[PDB]
Amino acid sequence: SEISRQEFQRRRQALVEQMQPGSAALIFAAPEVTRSADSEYPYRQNSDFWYFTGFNEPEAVLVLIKSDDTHNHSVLFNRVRDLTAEIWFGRRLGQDAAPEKLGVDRALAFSEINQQLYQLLNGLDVVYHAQGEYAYADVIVNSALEKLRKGSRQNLTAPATMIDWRPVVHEMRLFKSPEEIAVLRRAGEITAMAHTRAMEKCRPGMFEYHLEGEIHHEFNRHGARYPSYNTIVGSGENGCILHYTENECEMRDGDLVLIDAGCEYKGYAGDITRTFPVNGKFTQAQREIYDIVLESLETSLRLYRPGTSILEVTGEVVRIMVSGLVKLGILKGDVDELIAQNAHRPFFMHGLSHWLGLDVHDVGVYGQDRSRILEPGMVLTVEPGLYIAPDAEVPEQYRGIGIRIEDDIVITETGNENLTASVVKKPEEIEALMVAARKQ
Amino acid sequence: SEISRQEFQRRRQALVEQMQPGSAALIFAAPEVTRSADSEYPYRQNSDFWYFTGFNEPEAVLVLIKSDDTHNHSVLFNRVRDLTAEIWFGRRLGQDAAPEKLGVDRALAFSEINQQLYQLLNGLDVVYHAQGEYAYADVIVNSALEKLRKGSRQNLTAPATMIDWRPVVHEMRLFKSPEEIAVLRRAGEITAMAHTRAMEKCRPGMFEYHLEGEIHHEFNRHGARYPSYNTIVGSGENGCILHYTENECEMRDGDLVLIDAGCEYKGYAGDITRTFPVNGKFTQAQREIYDIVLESLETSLRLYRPGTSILEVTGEVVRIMVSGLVKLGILKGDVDELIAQNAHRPFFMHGLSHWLGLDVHDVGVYGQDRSRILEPGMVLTVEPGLYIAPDAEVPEQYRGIGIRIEDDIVITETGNENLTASVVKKPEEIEALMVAARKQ
Amino acid sequence: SEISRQEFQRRRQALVEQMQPGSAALIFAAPEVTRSADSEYPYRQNSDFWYFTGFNEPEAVLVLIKSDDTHNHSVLFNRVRDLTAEIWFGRRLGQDAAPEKLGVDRALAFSEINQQLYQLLNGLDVVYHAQGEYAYADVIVNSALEKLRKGSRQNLTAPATMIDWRPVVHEMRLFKSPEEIAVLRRAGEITAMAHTRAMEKCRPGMFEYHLEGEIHHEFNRHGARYPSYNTIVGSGENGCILHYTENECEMRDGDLVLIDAGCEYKGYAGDITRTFPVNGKFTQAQREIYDIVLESLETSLRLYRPGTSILEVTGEVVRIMVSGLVKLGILKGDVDELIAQNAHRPFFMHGLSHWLGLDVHDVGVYGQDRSRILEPGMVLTVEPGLYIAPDAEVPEQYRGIGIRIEDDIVITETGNENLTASVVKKPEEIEALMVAARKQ
Amino acid sequence: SEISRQEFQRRRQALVEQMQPGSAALIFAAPEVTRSADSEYPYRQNSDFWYFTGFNEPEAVLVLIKSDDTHNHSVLFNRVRDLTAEIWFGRRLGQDAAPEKLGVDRALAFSEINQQLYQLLNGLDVVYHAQGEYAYADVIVNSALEKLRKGSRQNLTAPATMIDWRPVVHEMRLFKSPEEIAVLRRAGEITAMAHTRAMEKCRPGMFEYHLEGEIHHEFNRHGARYPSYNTIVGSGENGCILHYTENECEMRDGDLVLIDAGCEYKGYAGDITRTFPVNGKFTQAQREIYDIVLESLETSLRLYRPGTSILEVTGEVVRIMVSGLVKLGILKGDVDELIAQNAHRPFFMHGLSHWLGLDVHDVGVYGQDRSRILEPGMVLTVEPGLYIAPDAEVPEQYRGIGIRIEDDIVITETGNENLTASVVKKPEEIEALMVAARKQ
Ligand SMILES: [Mg+2]
Ligand SMILES: [Mg+2]
Ligand SMILES: [Mg+2]
Ligand SMILES: [Mg+2]
Ligand SMILES: [Zn+2]
Ligand SMILES: [Zn+2]
Ligand SMILES: [Zn+2]
Ligand SMILES: [Zn+2]
Ligand SMILES: [Zn+2]
Ligand SMILES: [Zn+2]
Ligand SMILES: [Zn+2]
Ligand SMILES: [Zn+2]
Ligand SMILES: [Zn+2]
Ligand SMILES: [Zn+2]
Ligand SMILES: [Zn+2]
Ligand SMILES: [Zn+2]
Ligand SMILES: [Zn+2]
Ligand SMILES: [Zn+2]
Ligand SMILES: [Zn+2]
Ligand SMILES: [Zn+2]
């Protein structure tokens, strides 16, 4: 699946619809980023700029100009073509091919932006700009507006109103179109295949990073070159660290391993967590914690639908958690009192769900305490976990256990669709998968 | 292989030996780097800071203070320990464990650096600082020196002399110790195994990125998690682009594929290029160009030794190249005149050799035109190539061919040691390797 | 005359009337300014901040908050009281006395602004801020808005709209109240007395700066400590330099002297130019040029009224000028053609009139080519001049003559009131004044 | 008196003598400074730049290049000539006239500095630059050095050592030449005449600012256009504020007035304080405090000579002060104990003496607690004072009295020369001067 030319056009038009007449919106590309000395990290476009263009070059600026309710045009600033720079660092779109390729009306050289941008903003009333997003962008925008402010004898006037478009654009990104959902559906499948493979390859004596290598190879073979975030492979006590990315330890028979990993496919993030026994067989103590986390996930998957909220489903998870932990003797007391005291928090100290899309922790307003009423088209994670510290004052057998189980869902008219259920999470199914792999 | 505690200590002492008495050297860690929104790229330490510490955290500063020829001490600023921040983002060394772990005399909280650094610089005559390396470092250093300048009524004085330590430190990095050479030797082996595997896996109809995935998986399985630079897989005309990293094309029977890829192992870069037929059999036209590049490499490997230079060996390569191209009718005229006119430059437009180490394009002075006399301990690449443009005015059969062949070497007392010869480059050996793999 | 507490209150309310509901306006004080090393220039408050407060301290910020059409409040950030800092550098208002003294609702310590400002902006929709006016102000404002943007988990939201209040506030300043006109009337009288005195004191052999000293002493004795701009005393060829402030030459019998000087009285600028003979008697050649400039001024004073514009009156002046210069043989040809060719421009190369108020070149929109229709309450200068270069190709007797004559006026219901007519400008009256003084 | 072409040349040569071979010193002009909107304060050149040039324009840079012990040259960057900009804002030296006018070898356009400065620094070992003095200068210098650092393929190298020249140059400025002393001698005379005049003009009912006007007029008439610092006229309780510059109060019969005022003559500061009765007759209580301050001054004038220090003379003043105050009942106890407890500090809370020159509080190292041994050529103030707060718990008659008496001196071979003794300070002489004036 991919995003069409037409879809990028629709998105620009939907932004322009919300803009005041006599205004321009300025959306800037991500800068290139040094890794060390003269080597740079693989380029990652700004998600908002990508959303409106599908254009993967730096030194580019999308300018959407609204004259009135039925009249608007698009201008792209981008890198000029250059035989020498392209023989070295790779091909460029340039100005000639850009209108047709990216569906914009006009394309100018980014090297001329300081000579041209103020002319495009002259006489407008409003400019939409994400101030503080990038320092280079602020320099360009402030420089244009100062030229206009100070150029009254050349009959120039600056727009007096500046509006942050991030609220508007993030509210758009919060609701996925059918095309976006198809892409995320494939991201979830790719990510699932990677997690299945990690379970199948895991053996005692392999290092945490070996499973990372299997996962990344699987992403790559389906055309997802990069992960959406740095892969987490926390075996044993490392599973109690939420963003453990060192992945440097030998995996030991008897330990669990927690894998949080997700691909980036056409810009969109997969995001799955599976926790499983390194030796393919859960112990009793491991099952006892795992079952609480799994019931939490399974109950949440049943509950999530239009009209509820992350907050409301999180309350059900807290209840399941506090009850399970009391039954194991990890918590002591009255369930309802422990719930009122938030007694689960030493063991489950993060949110159940985040928005998912072009960023793994996606944009969009959550409402106070994530109380926003869910509607169809919202995409989110469901990721309960329990993390018992090596030195928690609890029965010995539960100490140093970290378990998270995470699926990615889209809210539908009647409930939700699970994008990541093609990798197993029921303990008996995990064990059968690993046994089958160890034969073959 | 690894770098010892003792070696990091030796390096600090070697820097201190060159410092003026009554001085302090300030070496800052790399900042963390955003990939998108709240997600960050995998952390890569500043190579110079790494060189003196082997410490892989941000928000850290090494301060080496020389009182006199026999008296000096080391101070580390680093992140304080924090239970909440470590449960989330992973473990920290802290101040208690640092002296023993990293062999420094004292360790302070990076959060206190503005309160402490000026006190360490007070009364000194010289400060060694890499001005403009990082903006956060300059803010910290300039702020310390202003406090001292303006604090004469508190009996404070700033050092009046500031010296860039990069020349000194890069000159040290230019000459590798036995330990560094052992590490680079393993980086070369790992990188070679990856390239061998790419040749063995290549089939028509696979995408360029599939070979990238094989290479990265192989790096990872030997404990080199990351590449030293973004992998290049240029098949067909893409091989004429020097840093082609899109790797997005279907590999076609009849084309060559150029792979430039290198692992990062204990901080040190491997860097190999192999070019080979996608279908496992070089055509006549492909052999004709390949043989010129291979003779260039093989002649260079014979010539490189103490007392010659990159410039001098490059002259021999130009001669081989111009002669080969004249014999094919790609160039026309007298060889010596064509050489004098640099007629090879449309086809070979980059340097033959760069320094190699903690950075793939490593630090160290080259001398004018890379004329510096080579000495034992220098590590460098040998990477001749020929790139015939799709639209070059040459016989049709050579158009759109890009071939580079690259090995990594260390200069020894009598010649050089080749770190990357365990992956084949002779055409008959390449073909046999691919045939054997295709059976299986 | 002075500006009342009530007037400052009215102005704030008039700004608040124009503000959107759910908004705050931020008006910052001028920074202190170094003259050399640790000595500073006499403090000059930002004119806009002064306009709303009459408060003459740095490190102060006026915050006007509009909840709705009938509900708003004012917050002042200002310097805390400090016995040591006040014994040294002088008295401070502080927070206790400020509400009553300056008519604001609340006053907080400027040292706490970063801890408090974001709390005042939280939940608002709009912030009025003059971006780029002062760098310290932008740092404070951007820092507040970033706290709000990134603080959604603390239930903070930033206003998405930022509006430049300078257009609104400058449009207010463009129309003077009766109180402001009374103050400017006194500024014009003070400035006139100074110019009268300079004419009375002028003798051949005195230096240009001596007349500057007389003028400044006269400003000071009426309670106008500072000039509104750097005083111009251009004798001879120095009169051809528009902002000649060197004032370093011996004044010579036979030369004219051009004095452009104005006091600052309760913040408001006087601005007068008189040109006169150093020896008290105009030559024929001097009269011939002077009469053109004087007719230009006198005709303009008759014409200026509601309904005309600076542009329209400037056209009449150009006609007078071109005609006078043709009659002297300084220009040659048809008057109407010379007018169409703007043939006056080598001799009169500046505007006839600028707005006058808290700044000598005051704020307010002029319209294209200063075409804005004049209305009652506008205050402006009328300053025709003719400047014949030392090397102009004109009859010898006119070379090196610079003459400007300038009065300050306020537009009334039926015409204008001249604020500066108490210093003579008719040549016979100038000569009589100087003769009388020489006896003284 | 003035400073000769030859003297400016000597100073540059004296700096070059101390510079390392293969180095360049960069001395930047002061930026222009806004007073309000488009009006600027009178230009004040950077004192160090002035010291080496006597050049009073902005956008200028002196570059002194030392090749070796007998070979060096000077380059000036300055504003190009421009007919339009000079007709408006006044005459410019330009490049043609500068070598001869300012005694430099070469002069280039400041508009070309970024294209030329790096070429002048290329291949040098050391650059002398006052980092953090001006932000525009740092931008220019850092930009030049980055070009050199990164331009090794164009055979460019940056100097690795940067040295602050301020210590060296301020140490030079600390010792005045005969020419400088002659200029300061005239500054002291001018300043004295101004103070004499203020005493002669003072009447009850005049405002503090009226005496400021008399003083400034007197500075101006002797060719000192500007004061060296903002004039202090503190009558009554205002005399207890050390830098009282409001000068806004009606002077009352019965009060003292403290005037601290100094001219700037050819760049050099006068700096005198005289305190006197507004009505021309000291009361008993006023005499009692005045006599302590006067004895302090007179004893200091006797003591100051080569071989003592400000610290040592300050100890004698403290003794005189504590003894006088004990005798009046302002302090109670044993003199030697009160001295040991620094019991004078509520009443005398500033230093006795500061260096004087191109800045009123001049550059130069004081040593710890101003303990530096005085040598011939040092110029300094002697300014004891006693300030009894309105609410000090002392006998009523001394409350609200501020008295300072200040003279400017130069250390000679055998003692000191008093530059400001031509204005009276003995109380009987003050009273006679005022009585004589009142007749005017
Ligand atoms: Mg256990
Ligand atoms: Mg072909
Ligand atoms: Mg003449
Ligand atoms: Mg009294
Ligand atoms: Zn249109
Ligand atoms: Zn965004
Ligand atoms: Zn996850
Ligand atoms: Zn997640
Ligand atoms: Zn020691
Ligand atoms: Zn470096
Ligand atoms: Zn390579
Ligand atoms: Zn290489
Ligand atoms: Zn209210
Ligand atoms: Zn303004
Ligand atoms: Zn004027
Ligand atoms: Zn004017
Ligand atoms: Zn020379
Ligand atoms: Zn200085
Ligand atoms: Zn003084
Ligand atoms: Zn003083």
mmCIF file of C-alpha atoms in Angstrom, chain B residues 258-373:
data_model
loop_
_atom_site.group_PDB
_atom_site.id
_atom_site.type_symbol
_atom_site.label_atom_id
_atom_site.label_comp_id
_atom_site.label_asym_id
_atom_site.label_seq_id
_atom_site.Cartn_x
_atom_site.Cartn_y
_atom_site.Cartn_z
ATOM 1 C CA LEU B 258 28.560 -1.611 -6.285
ATOM 2 C CA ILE B 259 28.421 -2.095 -2.504
ATOM 3 C CA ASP B 260 30.229 0.374 -0.216
ATOM 4 C CA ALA B 261 29.587 -0.723 3.359
ATOM 5 C CA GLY B 262 31.422 -0.805 6.669
ATOM 6 C CA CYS B 263 30.649 -1.743 10.261
ATOM 7 C CA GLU B 264 31.379 0.175 13.427
ATOM 8 C CA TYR B 265 33.106 -2.151 15.910
ATOM 9 C CA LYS B 266 34.135 -0.762 19.319
ATOM 10 C CA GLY B 267 33.928 2.692 17.696
ATOM 11 C CA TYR B 268 36.226 1.844 14.754
ATOM 12 C CA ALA B 269 35.176 1.788 11.116
ATOM 13 C CA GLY B 270 35.451 -0.932 8.529
ATOM 14 C CA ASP B 271 35.100 0.389 4.981
ATOM 15 C CA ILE B 272 34.923 -1.976 1.997
ATOM 16 C CA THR B 273 33.679 -1.620 -1.582
ATOM 17 C CA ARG B 274 33.045 -4.574 -3.826
ATOM 18 C CA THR B 275 31.485 -4.350 -7.283
ATOM 19 C CA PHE B 276 30.112 -7.542 -8.911
ATOM 20 C CA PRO B 277 27.661 -8.880 -11.487
ATOM 21 C CA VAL B 278 24.082 -9.238 -10.212
ATOM 22 C CA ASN B 279 23.801 -12.498 -12.235
ATOM 23 C CA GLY B 280 27.229 -13.813 -11.147
ATOM 24 C CA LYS B 281 29.003 -13.490 -14.523
ATOM 25 C CA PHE B 282 30.911 -10.381 -15.708
ATOM 26 C CA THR B 283 30.358 -9.412 -19.348
ATOM 27 C CA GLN B 284 33.373 -8.569 -21.542
ATOM 28 C CA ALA B 285 32.619 -4.824 -21.259
ATOM 29 C CA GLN B 286 32.281 -5.106 -17.470
ATOM 30 C CA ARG B 287 35.608 -7.045 -17.237
ATOM 31 C CA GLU B 288 37.389 -4.459 -19.357
ATOM 32 C CA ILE B 289 36.559 -1.672 -16.877
ATOM 33 C CA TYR B 290 36.839 -3.875 -13.777
ATOM 34 C CA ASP B 291 40.385 -5.001 -14.667
ATOM 35 C CA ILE B 292 41.623 -1.397 -14.813
ATOM 36 C CA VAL B 293 40.150 -0.688 -11.356
ATOM 37 C CA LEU B 294 41.549 -3.985 -9.980
ATOM 38 C CA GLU B 295 45.060 -3.400 -11.378
ATOM 39 C CA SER B 296 44.883 0.078 -9.822
ATOM 40 C CA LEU B 297 44.005 -1.448 -6.435
ATOM 41 C CA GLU B 298 46.557 -4.286 -6.691
ATOM 42 C CA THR B 299 49.382 -1.959 -7.796
ATOM 43 C CA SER B 300 48.511 0.441 -4.949
ATOM 44 C CA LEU B 301 48.571 -2.414 -2.412
ATOM 45 C CA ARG B 302 52.084 -3.273 -3.605
ATOM 46 C CA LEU B 303 53.296 0.353 -3.505
ATOM 47 C CA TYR B 304 51.919 1.565 -0.169
ATOM 48 C CA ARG B 305 54.666 1.611 2.443
ATOM 49 C CA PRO B 306 56.515 4.100 4.664
ATOM 50 C CA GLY B 307 58.128 6.875 2.615
ATOM 51 C CA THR B 308 55.644 7.179 -0.224
ATOM 52 C CA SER B 309 52.415 9.234 -0.107
ATOM 53 C CA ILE B 310 48.804 9.043 -1.257
ATOM 54 C CA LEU B 311 49.726 11.618 -3.942
ATOM 55 C CA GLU B 312 52.598 9.512 -5.307
ATOM 56 C CA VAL B 313 50.574 6.276 -5.472
ATOM 57 C CA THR B 314 47.630 8.233 -6.991
ATOM 58 C CA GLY B 315 49.946 9.211 -9.892
ATOM 59 C CA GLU B 316 50.582 5.548 -10.656
ATOM 60 C CA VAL B 317 46.828 4.864 -10.578
ATOM 61 C CA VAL B 318 46.142 7.752 -12.993
ATOM 62 C CA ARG B 319 48.711 6.245 -15.386
ATOM 63 C CA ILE B 320 47.142 2.769 -15.183
ATOM 64 C CA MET B 321 43.691 4.338 -15.683
ATOM 65 C CA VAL B 322 44.503 6.602 -18.640
ATOM 66 C CA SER B 323 46.350 3.719 -20.354
ATOM 67 C CA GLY B 324 43.482 1.265 -19.862
ATOM 68 C CA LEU B 325 40.882 3.778 -21.069
ATOM 69 C CA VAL B 326 42.922 4.685 -24.163
ATOM 70 C CA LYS B 327 43.177 0.975 -25.059
ATOM 71 C CA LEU B 328 39.357 0.704 -24.846
ATOM 72 C CA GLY B 329 38.785 3.868 -26.911
ATOM 73 C CA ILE B 330 37.163 5.669 -23.970
ATOM 74 C CA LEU B 331 39.990 8.245 -24.125
ATOM 75 C CA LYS B 332 41.799 9.211 -27.341
ATOM 76 C CA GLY B 333 45.332 10.540 -27.715
ATOM 77 C CA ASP B 334 48.801 10.379 -26.239
ATOM 78 C CA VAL B 335 48.855 8.817 -22.774
ATOM 79 C CA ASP B 336 51.379 11.277 -21.309
ATOM 80 C CA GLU B 337 49.479 14.286 -22.711
ATOM 81 C CA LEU B 338 46.139 12.904 -21.460
ATOM 82 C CA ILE B 339 47.760 12.364 -18.030
ATOM 83 C CA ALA B 340 49.038 15.983 -18.101
ATOM 84 C CA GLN B 341 45.510 17.170 -18.991
ATOM 85 C CA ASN B 342 44.037 15.047 -16.117
ATOM 86 C CA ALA B 343 41.836 13.357 -18.749
ATOM 87 C CA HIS B 344 40.882 10.620 -16.268
ATOM 88 C CA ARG B 345 38.801 13.078 -14.181
ATOM 89 C CA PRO B 346 35.371 12.632 -15.821
ATOM 90 C CA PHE B 347 35.707 8.915 -14.887
ATOM 91 C CA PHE B 348 37.686 8.977 -11.598
ATOM 92 C CA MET B 349 36.782 12.164 -9.743
ATOM 93 C CA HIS B 350 37.559 11.317 -6.110
ATOM 94 C CA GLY B 351 40.612 10.558 -3.994
ATOM 95 C CA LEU B 352 42.262 7.142 -3.902
ATOM 96 C CA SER B 353 42.675 6.999 -0.134
ATOM 97 C CA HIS B 354 41.358 8.475 3.087
ATOM 98 C CA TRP B 355 42.497 8.015 6.685
ATOM 99 C CA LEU B 356 40.438 5.419 8.574
ATOM 100 C CA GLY B 357 39.673 5.025 12.293
ATOM 101 C CA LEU B 358 37.049 6.194 14.801
ATOM 102 C CA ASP B 359 35.574 8.027 11.828
ATOM 103 C CA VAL B 360 35.366 6.367 8.428
ATOM 104 C CA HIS B 361 36.816 9.535 6.849
ATOM 105 C CA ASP B 362 39.235 9.912 9.706
ATOM 106 C CA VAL B 363 40.973 12.908 11.187
ATOM 107 C CA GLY B 364 44.613 13.790 10.552
ATOM 108 C CA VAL B 365 46.506 16.203 8.283
ATOM 109 C CA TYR B 366 46.921 14.976 4.675
ATOM 110 C CA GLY B 367 49.403 17.643 3.543
ATOM 111 C CA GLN B 368 48.928 19.607 0.313
ATOM 112 C CA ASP B 369 47.287 17.303 -2.286
ATOM 113 C CA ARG B 370 47.666 14.396 0.176
ATOM 114 C CA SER B 371 51.444 14.596 -0.169
ATOM 115 C CA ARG B 372 52.205 13.665 3.440
ATOM 116 C CA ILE B 373 54.920 10.996 3.774
#
